[PDB]
Copies of this chain bind each other. A is one copy, B any other.
């Protein structure tokens, strides 16, 4: 059971994702923060802030272990919040869980996915994002894209706002229905996919002109993002309740959020278009 190959891949993925983002920003770089746990592994937190293009970003790696026979969990997780409202926020995750025991068969599963959270969406980019997702799933099975794109729509929904968080992507958990080597190949395709799906959107939109009114809209929309993460997100909930590393866990929060009583964009404007059309459309292939 090649757990070491998985770890090597995940460390290389963090590096590659970090370099790709740095190359787009051309100004700020990722500062790294190593940490450990008493007899239970650790990780490398990597954060970027106040760049030309990325306002706030994190790409975290962790490999932790313990018991409850003796488990280990390794993954890469990221959330990118660009400065320019015309570049979408984005999130990705790929992880492996393995629990072993003498006199027993190992138990394991993969999880992860990626998703896009625009403020001023562009149809072209939404199709492109989902096209990358569809193509990477294709060799794994005829229904893999639709299964995991649907799961992504279901998970990233905010019932109390009756709104999707974004335009979707891929989401999966408890993945062990295929042989390990096939699930690991999937992990690699999803991680690779995120770079292919997101970086060209950043490159394309980062120099789009914007105004202070558009940042203000972006900041009200980031209130929705903070709401999903602090109220609904399962990973965030458990980390904060089980004594996880707070700053790593809340890396996902936006740099600035606004809330107003009955705040809403004006119908028929580009601001309202996200909620009128883009979030509800759901058909991107």
Contacts and interface: CB of A to CB of B under 8 A. Distances in A.
Copies in the complex: 2
Of the listed residues A56, A243, A249, A260, the one surrounded by the most CB atoms of chain B closer than 10 A to its CB is A260
Contacts of A210: none
A255 B259 contact: yes
Given A160-B246, A226-B226, A246-B160, A258 B255 contact: yes
A257 interface: yes
A261 interface: yes
Q: Which interface class (under 10, 10 to 19, 20 to 34, 35 or more) fits A?
A: 20 to 34
A262 interface: yes
Contacts of A33: 262
A161 interface: yes
B261 A226 contact: no
A212 to B, nearest CB: 14
Given A226-B226, A226-B230, A230-B230, A161 B246 contact: yes
Interface of A: 33, 45, 47, 49, 56, 58, 159-161, 219, 223, 226-227, 230-231, 237, 240, 243, 246-247, 249-251, 253-262
Contacts of A254: 259
Nearest to A261: B47
A217 B243 CA distance: 26
Cβ-closest 10 pairs across A and B:
A230-B230, A253-B259, A47-B261, A160-B240, A160-B246, A257-B257, A230-B231, A256-B258, A247-B262, A231-B240
A274 B63 CA distance: 36
A231 to B, nearest CB: 5
A173 B230 CA distance: 25
Contacts of A247: 261-262
Nearest to A45: B261
Question: Which of the listed residues A219, A231, A250, A261 has the most CB atoms from chain B within 10 Å of its own CB?
Answer: A261
